[PDB]
Motif scaffolding. Structure first.
Motif, PDB file in Angstrom:
ATOM      1  N   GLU A   1      21.854  17.282  16.194  1.00 51.05           N
ATOM      2  CA  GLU A   1      21.416  18.556  16.823  1.00 51.05           C
ATOM      3  C   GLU A   1      22.386  19.690  16.505  1.00 51.05           C
ATOM      4  O   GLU A   1      23.494  19.739  17.040  1.00 51.05           O
ATOM      5  CB  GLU A   1      21.322  18.345  18.336  1.00 51.05           C
ATOM      6  N   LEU A   2      21.963  20.597  15.632  1.00 49.50           N
ATOM      7  CA  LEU A   2      22.795  21.731  15.243  1.00 49.50           C
ATOM      8  C   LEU A   2      22.342  23.004  15.949  1.00 49.50           C
ATOM      9  O   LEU A   2      22.462  24.103  15.406  1.00 49.50           O
ATOM     10  CB  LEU A   2      22.746  21.929  13.727  1.00 49.50           C
ATOM     11  N   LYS A   7      23.144  24.728  24.849  1.00 52.67           N
ATOM     12  CA  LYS A   7      23.978  24.755  26.043  1.00 52.67           C
ATOM     13  C   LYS A   7      23.146  24.963  27.305  1.00 52.67           C
ATOM     14  O   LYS A   7      23.641  24.802  28.420  1.00 52.67           O
ATOM     15  CB  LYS A   7      25.027  25.857  25.924  1.00 52.67           C
ATOM     16  N   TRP A   8      21.883  25.319  27.122  1.00 54.75           N
ATOM     17  CA  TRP A   8      20.979  25.549  28.245  1.00 54.75           C
ATOM     18  C   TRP A   8      20.424  24.232  28.791  1.00 54.75           C
ATOM     19  O   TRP A   8      19.670  24.226  29.764  1.00 54.75           O
ATOM     20  CB  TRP A   8      19.828  26.461  27.819  1.00 54.75           C
ATOM     21  N   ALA A   9      20.798  23.119  28.162  1.00 62.62           N
ATOM     22  CA  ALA A   9      20.332  21.807  28.593  1.00 62.62           C
ATOM     23  C   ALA A   9      20.772  21.508  30.023  1.00 62.62           C
ATOM     24  O   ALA A   9      20.106  20.765  30.744  1.00 62.62           O
ATOM     25  CB  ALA A   9      20.843  20.731  27.647  1.00 62.62           C
TER      26      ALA A   9
END
Length: 13
Positions: A1-2, A7-9
């Motif tokens: 995963e690039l 970061k919203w995970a």
């Protein structure tokens, strides 16, 4: 995963 916007995970857990 690039994905930089991954970061919203933390907003769904």
């Amino acid at each position: 995963e690039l994905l930089e916007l991954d970061k919203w995970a933390s907003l769904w857990n």
